[PDB]
Design a protein around this ligand. Sequence first.
Ligand SMILES: Nc1ncnc2c1ncn2[C@@H]1O[C@H](CSCC[C@H](N)C(=O)O)[C@@H](O)[C@H]1O
Length: 314
Amino acid sequence: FLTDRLIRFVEEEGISELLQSMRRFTIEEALEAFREKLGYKLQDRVRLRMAKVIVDLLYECEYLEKKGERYFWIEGKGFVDFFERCIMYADKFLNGNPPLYSFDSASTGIWEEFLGNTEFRFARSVLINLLFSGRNDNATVLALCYGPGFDILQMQEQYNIRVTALDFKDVFQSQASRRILNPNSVKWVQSALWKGFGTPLPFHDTMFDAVFFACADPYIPEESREFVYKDIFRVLKHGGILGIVTRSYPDTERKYVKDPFVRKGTLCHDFSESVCEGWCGFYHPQESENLFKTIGYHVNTIMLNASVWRLDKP
Ligand SMILES: Nc1ncnc2c1ncn2[C@@H]1O[C@H](CSCC[C@H](N)C(=O)O)[C@@H](O)[C@H]1O
């Protein structure tokens, strides 16, 4: 299991030994001790975040209790995977080595194997039915940040839609074309027309019946996330729909992410994919719902522990 693997990492790197010897710590004190005692170079946001995720996971797994903002180590009384490869590298990354993977040509096979997994296929299929079930055929849909094209493939498997495909790099386009059911029917937009998150989408206002946005939310920088979703709102027709597949950072309130296995799994996913170039991490679900509402979306559906979102433009 992935959680057991990350716990084994925590123990083998001496993180658990350090924290139990400290006995009590705030997140700030723990991060200072990771720097001073383990020698981690927490020199950027993504590495500082990984260290925070480790503490959050130890708390979720009941190694720690919390009073106010202070954690306490709980003393016990007497008597092959993409994720595996990420965790195998995490010690090197935390010591300041470059990201393990990126969205460049050399890494395309890695992403193809990872994003083809059954859990992603399930989440995409649910969202596709949420967006298109019961609709008139041949909706105009933007497949945004489509990568290897599993999203386009599943959309064409399930429904007759007119896909416009856009990514911020063109490194996957040939692989996606050789995967989907109807490559001639797709409007492939050249990646030179869109620098990516933070730049306006190269489409006019109110053009699309739907925007499909799967597994790309955690690559949006915090500084740009409001704009990215406002700009998507701009290109949707009134009555159009934005579908998101992501994960939600486990919420203390347990309002959105309830399944204990999923709460642990999301933390381990976030820690692991932090070794990939550009990872920003999963966002808090209450803040996401608040953001979508202020932009002007109606929150039609939140499902799968707040991993699948249907957002309608009124
Ligand atoms: N800074 C950035 N701006 C726009 N897209 C970005 C980006 N960083 C990553 N991405 C894109 O986000 C995607 C992450 S992988 C998800 C691919 C596909 N949607 C699927 O469901 O499997 C990739 O297409 C990647 O090119």
